[PDB]
DNA sequence: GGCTATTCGCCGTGTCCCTCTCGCTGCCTATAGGTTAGACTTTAAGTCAATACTCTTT
RNA sequence: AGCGAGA
DNA sequence: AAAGAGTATTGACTTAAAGTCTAACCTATAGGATACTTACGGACACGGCGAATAGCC
């Protein structure tokens, strides 16, 4: 299973690289108001802020 | 003692034979191995943003038939490395497409 | 006979066996001709391999 | 080993480069009159080895002079002053 | 092949002037055996790294070759152990490569 | 963020429902920036808003829809891409990274962009 | 041969058909007549009446 | 089948993905790797013979400048027989010359890093242990290729962007 | 009543299959023209050598 | 072109 | 002031080279007439096409 999986992984990386072969930084800031919302901690039912587990990557 | 002795593995190459239909010197320790700077290595090089070294590698270390003697001359005599030219494989591609 | 002596220590590049190939015809260089004159030695033809 | 065994070396090329540099230098050390004849006898100046007649004609002199001097130059060029620095390029 | 050659030439064989020795052309057979023992996949260059290596090159069952599964076309289900292997083929000894 | 970058690359093309009156074949997959550019071009001189809808297309298709035949050819399915680009008399402007690698001039990234 | 056959689409010739043409397996017309076509069609209607009558006579 | 004029272009072995974007290169080496804990993070061992060969042009220049040899071809003869005088000059030249060390496959950006080479006796690139993870290179017969930047731009790039001590945090998750 | 179009299925062809490295074997006859190659007879270029006079050095 | 092998 | 060396003359001898001519010896082409007249993996995807039903001519 190791061999076929590394083959497919290499092909996938080739695909992803090609699609993103032209995503490079150009400007410092666009000042665009638009954005996304990230949840961070979720309100506890008793009332408390527990840090969301997958915050370090979000 | 397994039969993977270092003496049979160590290898180095500064200049030597080149392939026939293309430059990009001959691979293999048997002849004079030029180590393959394959595609993933190009990707790694790009990811650093390191562009001049990439161009140097793929042009005057590997293929460019005119620059190559020029860089050798510059190294021998101590001058600035010249500007890279067009790799000799792009022209064979042009001729084949034509 | 152009064969290295038996049981002899050798190093990378040392002549294992001395062979020479016929050079046929080769256009020589005037600068080489002047050199050969400076040393006044045999130009020689049979190519060395 | 024959695979592109007839391409450039970049070692022979540079060796020839410095060869002609040092040849022109050592030739420039001695008097020019010997130098023109030695150049064109073997055709170094322009690639045409001319004979005693042509050199004598170019400089309006008899071929016998040129043979003497080209022999005089050939005999004088055994001097280690010229041959010593230009010894290993052979 | 030899029988095909014979059968072909029989239409042009004058009757009673033919004997087996002039009738049989052995060259295809010798050619076939030679080209087998040289460059046939299942005629492998002996591997005498040590007596055990030479011994184990014998008794070696390869599933690939003329009329066999090649690495690419071979699936993932031929490579795994079968309960029938017990006592007929080693589940342990195997190349680690592709 | 890496993932966000990829999905961004995925969502850059809109499908054309209404051709309007401007050279857009129905079902065409056209970049949104060019879509807007055409729209600002055609609002004047008579407005014919060519309606379009966002669409999600696989990584392979997004790659093979680039405006660079020398890169698409380097990628995959060489024969078809060259035939298409030839029929269209397509001209590659040599702006990406794979292309600059292939022809051996300096990549426009990192130490290669026109400010450094 | 590269599907879709760009020649086939350009000329609107079905792929098998086009192949049979360009590999010398079936004839194709390339020009035809119009008005004088009408006038000799009437003449040709008479001539095929003659030929049909002859074949029916035999 | 005859290799048609188009088979030159397609596939893994077509012209696009064997010879244009990926090329073999001069001024490169390869050897097995052995852990060296005595090295600093920005250092890597490099065997004497391999370094001599890789740097044969530069060492020639230096030993002609030092008058150990009269001229270039005499110097080339001097190096081809590894004459004793050509080791000290070698130590002089290699100093402050960065080198890239790749380990195939380069799964990520940290698959190729620039170190400052140092001479070691025997035939084995002495790698720094702490970068082992970055290469995923573990010492049981891996072979690590070495590349030598030449141009001033390349040397700056290797010395600055690629230096092993300058890349500690992963580009993926930091 | 039959054929075609608008709607489904169905099947066939093409494309892809990680990287880097090491060692070893694979009938006959007849014409005509080229062809250089090979020797003869010129040269043309080269080498030796006598001689002598003038200039420079000790 | 074909074999075998290392990571 | 004398002697030695170099820079010239001239002739005399010598050898490569080379331009004709040969010859002979390869080399390229044509032709052959009793009668015979038919080979020897697997997944994804899209485009070219089975099976149906309804409507129109
Ligand atoms: Mg390992």
mmCIF file with all atom_site columns, C-alpha atoms (C1' of nucleotides) and ligand atoms in Angstrom, chain H residues 136-142, chain J residues 7, ligand 1:
data_model
loop_
_atom_site.group_PDB
_atom_site.id
_atom_site.type_symbol
_atom_site.label_atom_id
_atom_site.label_alt_id
_atom_site.label_comp_id
_atom_site.label_asym_id
_atom_site.label_entity_id
_atom_site.label_seq_id
_atom_site.pdbx_PDB_ins_code
_atom_site.Cartn_x
_atom_site.Cartn_y
_atom_site.Cartn_z
_atom_site.occupancy
_atom_site.B_iso_or_equiv
_atom_site.pdbx_formal_charge
_atom_site.auth_seq_id
_atom_site.auth_comp_id
_atom_site.auth_asym_id
_atom_site.auth_atom_id
_atom_site.pdbx_PDB_model_num
ATOM   1 C  CA    . UNK H 1 136 ? 13.425 12.918 6.445  1.00 0.00 ? 136 UNK H CA    1
ATOM   2 C  CA    . UNK H 1 137 ? 16.865 11.420 5.798  1.00 0.00 ? 137 UNK H CA    1
ATOM   3 C  CA    . UNK H 1 138 ? 17.786 8.577  8.146  1.00 0.00 ? 138 UNK H CA    1
ATOM   4 C  CA    . UNK H 1 139 ? 21.266 7.071  8.205  1.00 0.00 ? 139 UNK H CA    1
ATOM   5 C  CA    . UNK H 1 140 ? 21.048 3.611  6.689  1.00 0.00 ? 140 UNK H CA    1
ATOM   6 C  CA    . UNK H 1 141 ? 22.095 4.141  3.090  1.00 0.00 ? 141 UNK H CA    1
ATOM   7 C  CA    . UNK H 1 142 ? 20.353 7.252  1.891  1.00 0.00 ? 142 UNK H CA    1
ATOM   8 C  "C1'" . A   J 2 7   ? 16.793 4.715  -0.487 1.00 0.00 ? 7   A   J "C1'" 1
HETATM 9 MG MG1   . LIG L 3 .   ? 16.320 5.179  5.025  1.00 0.00 ? 1   LIG L MG1   1
#
